[PDB]
Symmetry: C6
């Protein structure tokens, strides 16, 4: 990464590979990825993705997404040809941002320029976009099917609900609505009755303490 | 964290994730969290919370608490609109402090300003507030139910008492009173008799050495 | 490596040796190698290759490849004899680049000169060239033999396809064609029918969600 | 710690928690604590104590001891009220030293002042005082009960003797006397006879080599 | 090591001790040794050798070799007596290079002088010379006895051949000849026939792909 | 240690404690100790010794030895009383060197003075002196009892011989003589005959290759 440049740390790299081995594509993999790639160059970012053995269906989807974002980038930032002046960098293309048509030193040039052409953070955006698609698609459950069982402690139901929620394809307002409707609606008869009695203004803290017994 | 800024360390992060895997929400998780987040930016803080897979009931309660503290913040610090001058930062909102409507560079701007707008320490406060609620709620036992058994070594009873005490929803003065009343009151007849004989001025050292035999 | 020079880290080195123990010569070994050798001197690079115990058939092929690239280098950069002036370095030969006829201090001299004679990155190129040959040759499967099974979840077939693809001796355009033809062509009758119905413009995301059920 | 200030390291912290898990309160825990807390702020010190889950009987005794030392401190250093001048720090109270009524920045202010108000080393003193009480109290054996067995190799007896000795509540002169009297006195008849014959000027080296056979 | 001087790292040291525990004296131990001792002082080097428990037959041979190289050094660099001037170092003897009659500060003096008396790299040379003798002597197999078995995959034969080759006492030209003669000559009848048909100009890549089936 | 001062590293410390757990007092423990204590203050040194749980017979012998060396030090360096001038340090006593009557800052004062009063290296000397006594005394075997068995590979006999040799109480010249006499003298009849035939000028390399078959 950049803090000029240093090599991606072996411990960071192995951390990233361990995460993908164990967790597959659970939601928490994405903040984990962001943390391990803070200040990363496109090179470092490619290193991280390429280091993954297996899950090549997902890694291929991630390439396709990256190439979409690259094409969009080109479309919005059309190249202006000419001799690049002394003390200046060329305008990065879609592929320069994703690291396949740029050198490390060009990447360092962009990231440390005044003002910066922040290509790592652009590429990280695109990567995370692709990671989000995969997480969603690889989620086994649907939020509409999370139903508290007759003798299931409320806390375990809430744990399943919000896990499934975190992997859903939905904006914040749509998630807010799933909480407004489904959580209470899909509780078991006893808890459901008690939570209806608390009203629709009640906090999760309130609801959980209410169905403790 | 800030010491300007560096990436949250992979070892720090994995430390934090390991703690939540093993300890769940035992009281000691909170000082552990403070230690691993010393100098953290809101981004780093979010990284740490988001890295947690599972316990999404608790992580959701923690969001709700954070949003309460954010609303309170807004209420007390009402926004003053206008063009921000050169060499100045905008006044942070509730959501800017919690990292969802601020960039990392805005966070770095606030934390390193003269005088600092110490947004990490504010957000850490709010997080720990939420962590304290969860610990309490997830405590299995009540302090009123800790009773020394007939053949239970006094030290093991004191160990259960003060563990349960540490997870209670009570100020220092209320805790002081639980010690004043319950510890001696809920000892077994033999130890109880011996500790009554020491009087109410006796130290824990004194009490433990007294019921050693 | 160079960041002047420091010793290759013991953790980096053991990382590299662990990778070759576990993964043998799976495709992901090569980005792993690049990451662990960022800024490496030819010495450091030789250290990494020499540290490998076993796989001496492959390590011998890698030597042969290195010596080919060295001979090519000599051919294109013919030596110009004469006394090297003060404040100057000799032109590196093929073997100087590969570290067998150069000292560490000569390597440091080249890598830190203005402009640099970037001998580490040249030698890394040649090494990776040799690593790519070995990966291909040591691949057990051929892309033409990857056929989805009658009850095989489409995702597992796509996982086998793109794993085998990544180890193939083929340019990007030839890979693009294997995707254009073989993926859909070698699916099982049910999925094959559904993917034919999507047409040849369909994304992998689209194709996978289509054959989910 | 301070070396200005950096966060307590995650490895240091986990080291400390591991020590208390494994060793409980064996004597060697205290030098271990001193090592892991070199240059610590009161905050760092509290972090270390608070990180301990379990042993809350002992952790409570340690609080009581800390509060005693704090009260003594107040008694000897009575507060002098007034506006603190520019370029000056307030006189630390007992609780400021123990970190509960001081900020980290006040602690850093004291520890880095010219001359320093060395609050970490004061609090560490008090902590170690409390740790010493606990070790003693939690020692299972008494030095008066360590008796060499009939077929016990002298070296194993000396190992038990000096282990039990290290956990005793006794000054150096009292320990010197336990060595003068008990070691030889409580040896088995054969070794006891041989060590009486060496006289009271003999070194431990001499005594051990004497009872080797 | 020197990068002035720092202590040999505990991780480096334990790395070195682990290598000798596991690998004994396989060829790869020597590049491993060079890597872990980059910039080492004679002291550091002695530390590494002395840290080895066991294999004292080999460690004794290594001493004998070191003392030979030391005697040779003395012979070629005969001592010139006299008062050493201010701003000057004495000429190092054989034993000064090997660290037994020099202080660390004398070693640092030599290694950092302008021009350097590079005593670490001299002693490392001598050590590696001794390590090479041991590897050879401790090799179980002879290159003349490596014969492909009737149903042995060619790749496994080539793996045994080049492993045994790497431990041989032979210059490059002699190794080149063992490849020219023995590899093909000692293949099984089927592979042997196919490799004879490729001719004596064929690469290892070519030969291995030829005997794949 | 000093490189001014930093805290002994947790990894160094745990390294040292692990060594004493596993190896007990095998000869290699002493170079291990020197490595882990390079640049150590007396405080750091005491930390390392005090961190050892168990082996208190040996740790007590080590104290006795330290106190002997301290008394000798006092004897040779008799204290000269008077007011210590500005810009000066008091002359260290035996106990100041061993860290029990000196502060860390006094130790840092001595070690960094121009010229240095190198108290760490003095105390390390004394410690290693004591460690050497213990190793010798705790050695199970005597060099006079190492006899090659009738079917024992010569290399294993040489391994036992030089291990036992390394733990002996003997100068270099006395060790040289044990090699001159005992090694060949205590070989089995077959090897003994062959080594007599090589003569008394033969190297260990020569002797081992001679008794290979
Ligand atoms: Cl690392
Ligand atoms: Cl994987
Ligand atoms: Cl998955
Ligand atoms: Cl790749
Ligand atoms: Cl796969
Ligand atoms: Cl450019
Ligand atoms: Cl942008
Ligand atoms: Cl479900
Ligand atoms: Cl409802
Ligand atoms: Cl790290
Ligand atoms: Cl978890
Ligand atoms: Cl829980
Ligand atoms: Cl997230
Ligand atoms: Cl869960
Ligand atoms: Cl702003
Ligand atoms: Cl505030
Ligand atoms: Cl209970
Ligand atoms: Cl009562
Ligand atoms: Cl390292
Ligand atoms: Cl291997
Ligand atoms: Cl393989
Ligand atoms: Cl090699
Ligand atoms: Cl092999
Ligand atoms: Cl040159
Ligand atoms: Cl080039
Ligand atoms: Cl297949
Ligand atoms: Cl088709
Ligand atoms: Cl760390
Ligand atoms: Cl514990
Ligand atoms: Cl205990
Ligand atoms: Cl706490
Ligand atoms: Cl407990
Ligand atoms: Cl103040
Ligand atoms: Cl004080
Ligand atoms: Cl006992
Ligand atoms: Cl007696
Ligand atoms: Cl380390
Ligand atoms: Cl070993
Ligand atoms: Cl061996
Ligand atoms: Cl040694
Ligand atoms: Cl051995
Ligand atoms: Cl000199
Ligand atoms: Cl030389
Ligand atoms: Cl063989
Ligand atoms: Cl032939
Ligand atoms: Cl560390
Ligand atoms: Cl131990
Ligand atoms: Cl032992
Ligand atoms: Cl101690
Ligand atoms: Cl013991
Ligand atoms: Cl002084
Ligand atoms: Cl001295
Ligand atoms: Cl024996
Ligand atoms: Cl003889």
């Amino acid at each position: 990464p950049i803090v000029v440049h240093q090599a991606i740390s072996p411990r960071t790299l192995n951390a990233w590979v361990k995460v993908v081995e164990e967790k597959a594509f659970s939601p928490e993999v994405i903040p984990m990825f962001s943390a391990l790639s803070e200040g990363a160059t496109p090179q470092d970012l490619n290193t991280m993705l390429n280091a993954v053995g297996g899950h090549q269906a997902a890694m291929q989807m991630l390439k396709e997404t990256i190439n979409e974002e690259a094409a969009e980038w080109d479309r919005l930032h059309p190249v202006h040809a000419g001799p690049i002046a002394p003390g200046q960098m060329r305008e990065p293309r879609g592929s320069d941002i994703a690291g396949t048509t740029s050198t490390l030193q060009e990447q360092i040039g962009w990231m440390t320029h005044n003002p910066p052409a922040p290509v790592g953070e652009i590429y990280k955006r695109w990567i995370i976009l692709g990671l989000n698609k995969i997480v969603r698609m690889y989620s086994p459950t649907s939020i509409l099917d999370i139903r508290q069982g007759p003798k299931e402690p409320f806390r375990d139901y809430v744990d399943r609900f919000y896990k499934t929620l975190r992997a859903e394809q939905a904006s914040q307002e749509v998630k807010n609505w799933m909480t407004e409707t489904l959580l209470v609606q899909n509780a078991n008869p006893d808890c459901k009755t008690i939570l209806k009695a608390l009203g629709p203004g009640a906090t999760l803290e309130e609801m959980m303490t209410a169905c403790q017994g």
